[PDB]
Design a binder for this molecule. Structure first.
Ligand SMILES: [Mg+2]
Ligand SMILES: [Mg+2]
Ligand SMILES: [Mg+2]
Ligand SMILES: [Mg+2]
Ligand SMILES: [Mg+2]
Ligand SMILES: [Mg+2]
Ligand SMILES: [Mg+2]
Ligand SMILES: [Mg+2]
Ligand SMILES: [Mg+2]
Ligand SMILES: [Mg+2]
Ligand SMILES: [Mg+2]
Ligand SMILES: [Mg+2]
Ligand SMILES: [Mg+2]
Ligand SMILES: [Mg+2]
Ligand SMILES: [Mg+2]
Ligand SMILES: [Mg+2]
Length: 148
RNA sequence: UUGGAGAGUUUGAUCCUGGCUCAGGGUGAACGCUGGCGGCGUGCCUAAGACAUGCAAGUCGUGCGGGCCGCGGG
């Protein structure tokens, strides 16, 4: 099975005659603390169903992060819309230096040592995907020679 | 490569822009409430305004000639 963290659970609403009607949205990261993470965002008429749906999509969307002593191989910068995430290799003592959103992702991914920074829009959702696509572009010394 | 966390607040809700705000470290500090001990620091940031009183630069008789006192004695 997988380890699971709720990053964001927010209420939205829409208007109608007679009043606002709500809906809930569930940002969930899911991982094995050993190189496999998934991000899922899920909506439903109620809180828990949404969390459940969220967790579901998460598994249906994964990425294999190439750890190396608990740190990523190389520097990576990624922009998703106006959001930017910076990922930077750190040595053993460092810890994970990051805000909650990319923290939850990197920890449950088994990253244990990394320097990060959020730039631009720090909307959680967008920072979330931006951290994902970031990880998803990581390449290994091998990966590269093999390509070239 | 010893190194990099962010949050609140514009909307019915969203994304973005954008300012305000906060958490951190610092000080010749000051103010309040409170206050036992020791060590190293450290203390007129304002009127280079004004200052009573003592003290902060003198020494050599192995450069010189004198007075005053005394010690030694003709
Ligand atoms: Mg790979
Ligand atoms: Mg963005
Ligand atoms: Mg851009
Ligand atoms: Mg390295
Ligand atoms: Mg914000
Ligand atoms: Mg308001
Ligand atoms: Mg407006
Ligand atoms: Mg409101
Ligand atoms: Mg802001
Ligand atoms: Mg006091
Ligand atoms: Mg007192
Ligand atoms: Mg002065
Ligand atoms: Mg005056
Ligand atoms: Mg005066
Ligand atoms: Mg004296
Ligand atoms: Mg002489």
């Amino acid at each position: 099975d997988f380890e699971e963290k709720m990053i964001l659970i927010r209420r939205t609403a829409r208007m109608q005659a007679g009043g606002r009607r709500f809906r809930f949205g569930a940002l969930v990261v899911v991982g094995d603390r050993q190189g496999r993470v998934g991000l899922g965002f899920g909506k439903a008429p109620e809180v828990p169903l949404a969390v459940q749906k969220a967790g579901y999509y998460a598994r249906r969307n994964m990425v294999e992060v190439p750890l190396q002593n608990g740190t990523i191989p190389h520097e990576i910068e990624v922009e998703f819309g106006a959001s930017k995430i910076v990922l930077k290799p750190a040595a053993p003592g460092t810890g994970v230096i990051a805000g909650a959103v990319p923290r939850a992702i990197l920890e449950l991914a088994g990253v244990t040592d990394i320097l990060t920074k959020e730039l631009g829009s720090r909307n959680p959702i967008n920072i979330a995907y931006a951290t994902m696509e970031a990880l998803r572009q990581l390449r290994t010394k091998a990966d590269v020679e093999r390509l070239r």
